Amino acid sequence: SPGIWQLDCTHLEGKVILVAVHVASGYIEAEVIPAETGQETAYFLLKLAGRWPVKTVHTDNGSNFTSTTVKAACWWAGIKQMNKELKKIIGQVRDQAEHLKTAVQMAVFIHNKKRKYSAGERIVDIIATDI
Amino acid sequence: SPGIWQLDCTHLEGKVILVAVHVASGYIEAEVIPAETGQETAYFLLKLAGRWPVKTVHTDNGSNFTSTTVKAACWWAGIKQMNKELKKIIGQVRDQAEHLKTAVQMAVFIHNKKRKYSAGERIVDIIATDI
Ligand SMILES: Cc1nc2ccccc2c(-c2ccc3c(c2)CCCO3)c1[C@H](OC(C)(C)C)C(=O)O
Ligand SMILES: Cc1nc2ccccc2c(-c2ccc3c(c2)CCCO3)c1[C@H](OC(C)(C)C)C(=O)O
Ligand SMILES: [Mg+2]
Ligand SMILES: [Mg+2]
């Protein structure tokens, strides 16, 4: 179903990477964050919700969504309640960038553009079809 | 044409807001950045290019794209070479958030979801149709 996303954090090089997966297509977005915090999670959700029609969000760590900040983002935005593949791509491209965050965006790009349609095409098709 | 984006920075409260507009649909993405720098512009482009099929980028300040960092992002990603409306929405929502960056994501959301279809729907339709 088109309005469902999963959100989790992973760790790499002593930093945190927030990873959202659009479950039906396999499309991802990701950001490197200072801290695994309610505030970064909330902020990220607001950005996500402005781009795609986000209806529900799931996570593998339910305590992620406990803060007042997250609940306030989900309320305002109307929302209700690849780790290893991505780390694989990141490791393939890692020597070509100085900052981890650059390598992560490189790996998101590679992941979303790779064919079997690509995840980036699937999301847009799934969402356009649902309009 | 579906692969064309415009990118510019504006200023507000002594901060910089990077604003990308998908020209055919009127869809926007935006981020608050510390400095108007080549590095932030490059990083932003990499993120943008991983989400949408970005073919060409325009700007109102051509010197924006002069750095080695920007040229390197555009090379790697395969890329070639609302200010007032957004500031209007930001001013409408500004008292409801503590940080400017929150208000900016609120205004992006409001802008992309507002009907005459919404910009968020137009982009996905335009892009799906082009696949
Ligand atoms: C600092 C901060 N503190 C809070 C304390 C508890 C109440 C929620 C918040 C939110 C938040 C605020 C507004 C908001 C959304 C989430 C959702 C959108 C409508 O308004 C923020 C915001 O900052 C973060 C997003 C970084 C957490 C803010 O800038 O105001
Ligand atoms: C610090 C930095 N310095 C440079 C000096 C000149 C050469 C380009 C860069 C780039 C850049 C790097 C790789 C890259 C793209 C842009 C495009 C993608 C393929 O690799 C970066 C990157 O950092 C920023 C993105 C913040 C500028 C980096 O992390 O390596
Ligand atoms: Mg997690
Ligand atoms: Mg500018």
Q: What is the CATH number of the domain that holds B19?
A: 3.30.420.10
For residue A35, count other CB atoms closer than 10 A to its CB.
Answer: 10
Mutate to test the interface with B, among A90, A105, A118 (most CBs of B within 10 A): A105
Determine if ligand 2 sits within 6 Å of the CB of residue A109.
no
CA distance A37 to A13: 18
Query: What DSSP state is assigned to residue B95?
Result: G
Alpha-carbon torsion A131, B1, B3, B9, what sign? negative
Q: What are phi and psi of A80, to 5 degrees?
A: -115, 160
Please give the distance, rounded to the nearest whole angstrom, from the Cα atom of residue A36 to the centre of ligand 2: 25
C-alpha R_g of chain A: 15
Residues on chain A touching B93 (C-beta within 8 angstroms): none
Q: Where are the beta strands (DSSP E) in B23-121?
A: 27-33, 56-58
The 3-state DSSP composition of chain B as helix, strand, coil percent (nearest 5) reads 50, 25, 25
For residue B62, count other CB atoms closer than 10 A to its CB.
Answer: 9
Pairing assessment for the beta strands A4-12 and A56-58 based on DSSP bridges: parallel
Domains in chain B, number: 1
What are the CA-CA distances from residue A115 to residues A13, A118, B16, B83 (Å)? 29, 4, 36, 36
Alpha-carbon torsion B71, B74, B75, B77, what sign? positive
User: If we measure between CA atoms, which residue out of B98, B109, B87 comes closest to residue B29?
Assistant: B109
The 3-state DSSP composition of chain A as helix, strand, coil percent (nearest 5) reads 50, 25, 25
Residue that is written with structure tokens 């992309």 in the block:
B112
The shortest CB-CB distance from B50 to any of A112, A125, A128 is to: A112
Q: What is the residue range of B82's domain?
A: 1-131
| Structure obtained using | X-ray
Residue of B nearest to A51 (CA): B120
Determine if ligand 2 sits within 6 Å of the CB of residue A95.
no
CA distance A11 to A116: 27
Amino acid residing at A51: R
Quick one: resolution in A? Answer: 2.2
